[PDB]
Write a protein that binds this ligand. Structure first.
Ligand code: YBH
Ligand code: YBH
Lengths: 178, 88, 88, 178
């Protein structure tokens, strides 16, 4: 290992776990850690769906920064990243179903799913969304499409879902006096 | 021979805000939840499991300024600790 | 002087099963999730935070027999580790 | 401390945390632990709502065992426990609103809420529940009634909600071949 850490490697800005630390974690916890596959043979997959350009709702300016950051991070962590942009709820479902059918999951130990869009209380907005005609993908549907029934390849494997979206109109705050 | 398996297991969701509430984004800097998630993942993936990292992300939002949000972990069926072991 | 606070923070929910799914109960022995929760709380409250204990409860259900269920942690906004410090 | 541990004390069957262990936890984690109030002055509260006898749905035989176990455990952990039985969704709401208004929360560091009933996908069943006329308390309502707005006394304090209930009709399983 180099004297000074460098971001020029495959892990970029992600701080490396040493062999001393990896064995310490293997010792501090017995059989309560998810198994990791060999780095030489594993085919880790990740999917990013990001909606920026919408038909009827405000443009999500700055989303490109999120896409860049999340893509580079998941790659740093060892995942091959699919990036899909400006999709309807129907398109999101079709893409998720296809992702769940990917052969690479069989030789993978985990997956990351990332959704970035506008959102309401009920779920995540598709590109064609409006108040008059809703275009919503529910979080419930995401779980269903990736469970043991609909995605047997990811049985016993960590499935991490990250969602950047509003969940309603409210500012999320209340006042109090000290 | 066939065996039984849980239909839903080993999931974790991480949302940018609590139900009913907005999530923030800057036109040039991106989404605060995403930026904060990356920074924490970069720093703590080596030493902490994903549940712990997400908690740390939540903690970073604890003190509310002019604009506030509270990321929420949802529908967790992780039966074990998920360590990323970056570099391995 | 008034200050801002998160409307929703420091919550953790623990449900006996996953959405769509049944939870089991014995006519003389009680509910399996409740019994298992008590046993794990009795054993691990001294050394583990509540999130960790709940995960251990989930782990105990991992291997499905004739009847199966998977307890789920929900809507978590705990920003810190909650240790019970039993005896203190 | 006694040579052999005894369940005759206030903590009963709950394994005690020693002073060596408490300081070790205080050291292993810096400022990322919830503060605990002094044992001499704190007024910890917990609430158990359990529905066993129903108008139109099957009797939850064995629930008494759950009530006994959970009541004794929460007491062992230092909580004063309220036990309320056979309530409609309306009754559950009124009881939860009253719990959130309890003066003791101001001199408490945390709370436990326990719900034990029949349940469907949408939420927890009240005593008068039937398919024709639903009597349901949603998990969403529970959180709302205990948040910073509706329960300012529990601001910054851990609120643990435990729910024993069915969440639908399904057995929760799928088959696979080894
Ligand atoms: C809702 O669906 C979307 C979610 C999305 O990801 O698009 N949200 C909105 O539409 C937002 C748009 C916000 C645009 C206005 N931006 C800003 O004025 C602004 C200013 C500063 C800033 O930086 C920081 C710095 N530090 C922070 C700490 C904690 C939290 C946030 C912080 N932000 C970011 C953004 C909404 C439109 C109206 C209300 S929300
Ligand atoms: C749904 O709303 C309710 C939830 C509630 O808390 O009441 N559930 C039901 O109504 C159940 C009732 C189940 C009654 C039948 N009991 C049994 O046959 C039975 C047998 C053995 C047993 O013990 C064990 C032992 N080990 C276990 C390990 C893991 C999981 C479960 C285990 N159980 C328990 C119960 C339903 C009625 C129909 C379907 S579910």
């Amino acid at each position: 290992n180099p004297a000074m850490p460098t971001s020029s490697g495959s892990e970029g800005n992600v701080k490396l776990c040493s062999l001393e630390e990896a064995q310490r974690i293997w010792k501090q916890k017995s059989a309560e850690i998810y198994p990791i596959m060999d780095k030489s043979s594993r085919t880790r997959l990740a999917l990013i769906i990001c909606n920026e350009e919408f038909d009827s709702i405000p443009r999500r300016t700055g989303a490109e920064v999120d896409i860049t950051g999340m893509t580079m991070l998941l790659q740093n962590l060892g995942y091959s990243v699919d990036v899909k942009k400006n999709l309807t709820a129907s398109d999101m479902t079709t893409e998720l179903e296809a992702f769940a059918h990917r052969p690479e999951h069989k030789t993978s130990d985990s997956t990351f799913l990332v959704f970035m869009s506008h959102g309401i209380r009920e779920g995540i907005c598709g590109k064609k969304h409006s108040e008059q005609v809703p275009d919503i993908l529910q979080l419930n549907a995401i779980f269903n499409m990736l469970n043991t029934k609909n995605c047997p390849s990811l049985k016993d494997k960590p499935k991490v879902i990250i969602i950047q979206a509003c969940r309603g109109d409210s500012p999320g705050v209340v006042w109090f006096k000290d | 021979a066939i065996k039984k398996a849980h239909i839903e297991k080993d999931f974790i969701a991480f949302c940018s805000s609590t139900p009913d509430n907005v999530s923030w984004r800057h036109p040039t800097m991106g989404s605060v939840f995403i930026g904060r998630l990356i920074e924490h993942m970069q720093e703590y993936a080596c030493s902490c499991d994903v549940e712990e990292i997400f908690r740390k992300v939540r903690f970073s939002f604890e003190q509310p300024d002019g604009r506030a949000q509270m990321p929420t972990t949802e529908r967790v069926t992780l039966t074990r600790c998920f360590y990323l072991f970056p570099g391995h």
